[PDB]
JSON list of C-alpha atoms in Angstrom, two decimals:
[
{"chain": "A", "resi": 1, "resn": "UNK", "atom": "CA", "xyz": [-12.28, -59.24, -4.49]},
{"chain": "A", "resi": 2, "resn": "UNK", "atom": "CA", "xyz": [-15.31, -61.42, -4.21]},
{"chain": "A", "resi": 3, "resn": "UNK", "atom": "CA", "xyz": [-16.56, -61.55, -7.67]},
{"chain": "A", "resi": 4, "resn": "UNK", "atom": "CA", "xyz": [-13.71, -62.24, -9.92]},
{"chain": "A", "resi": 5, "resn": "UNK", "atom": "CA", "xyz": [-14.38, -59.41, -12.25]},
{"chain": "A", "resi": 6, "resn": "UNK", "atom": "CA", "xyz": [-11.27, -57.49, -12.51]},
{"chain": "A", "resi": 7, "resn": "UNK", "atom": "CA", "xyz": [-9.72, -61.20, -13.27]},
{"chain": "A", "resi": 8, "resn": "UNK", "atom": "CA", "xyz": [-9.18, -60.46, -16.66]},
{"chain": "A", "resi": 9, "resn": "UNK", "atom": "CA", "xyz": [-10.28, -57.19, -18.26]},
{"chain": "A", "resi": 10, "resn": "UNK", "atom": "CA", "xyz": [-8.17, -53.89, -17.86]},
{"chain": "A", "resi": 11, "resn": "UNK", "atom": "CA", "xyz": [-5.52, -55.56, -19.78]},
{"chain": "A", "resi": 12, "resn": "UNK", "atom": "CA", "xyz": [-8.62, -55.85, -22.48]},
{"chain": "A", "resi": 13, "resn": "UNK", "atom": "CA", "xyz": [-10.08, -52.22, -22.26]}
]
């Protein structure tokens, strides 16, 4: 999506 935000976290939290 526009934003790049879930680019790299859920694998983090």
């Amino acid at each position: 999506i526009l934003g790049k935000i879930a680019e790299g976290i859920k694998s983090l939290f």
